[PDB]
Amino acid sequence: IFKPEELRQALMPTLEALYRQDPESLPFRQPVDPQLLGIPDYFDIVKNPMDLSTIKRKLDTGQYQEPWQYVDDVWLMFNNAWLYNRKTSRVYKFCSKLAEVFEQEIDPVMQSLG
C-alpha cells in the first residue's frame, strides 16, 4: 500500500520531465477540445481522452492509488495521439518524444517503488 503524498513525490519528477519538453509537451499541456478545433470525429476515435493537465490534477488529488494507474494514464495520452494523428504530424512526432522521455524516467522509479 502507498501513502498518497509519497506516491505523488516518487512520480512527480517523471511528470515534470514530460512538461519540460519544449516544444514537444505543448500539444499535451491541456485537453484536446474537438468543438474548438472543429474535429467532430475525435471522440469517435478517442473514447477516453487524457492530457498532462488531467494527469497532474489526478497525481495531486490522490486519484492514483497505485503506480500503474498513473503509467496507464500516461500511455492512454500517448495512444490517443498515435491513433488519431498522422505518423509524421507534429502531434504524433511530439508524442513519440514524450514517450521516449517517459520510458527513460518511469523505469527506475517503478523499480524503486517495487
* Exposed/middle/buried for residue 41 (C-beta within 10 Å: 0-12, 13-18, 19+): exposed
Start-end of H helices in 20-51: 34-37, 42-45
Q: Report whether 105 contacts 14 (CB < 8 A).
A: yes
Query: Which residue reads 490517443 in cell numbers?
Result: 80
Q: Which cell numbers hold the place of 40? A: 467532430
Structural determination approach: X-ray
Resolution in A: 2.0
User: Domains, the chain, ranges and CATH?
Assistant: 1-114 (1.20.920.10)
Cell output for 43: 471522440
Q: Are 67 and 110 in contact (CB under 8 A)?
A: yes
Task: Kindly compute the dihedral angle of the four CA atoms of residues 107, 73, 52, 80, in this order, to the nearest 10 degrees.
Answer: 110
In what helix (H) or strand (E) does residue 82 lie, and over which residues does it extend?
A: helix 67-84
For the record, the C-alpha cell of 91 comes out as: 502531434
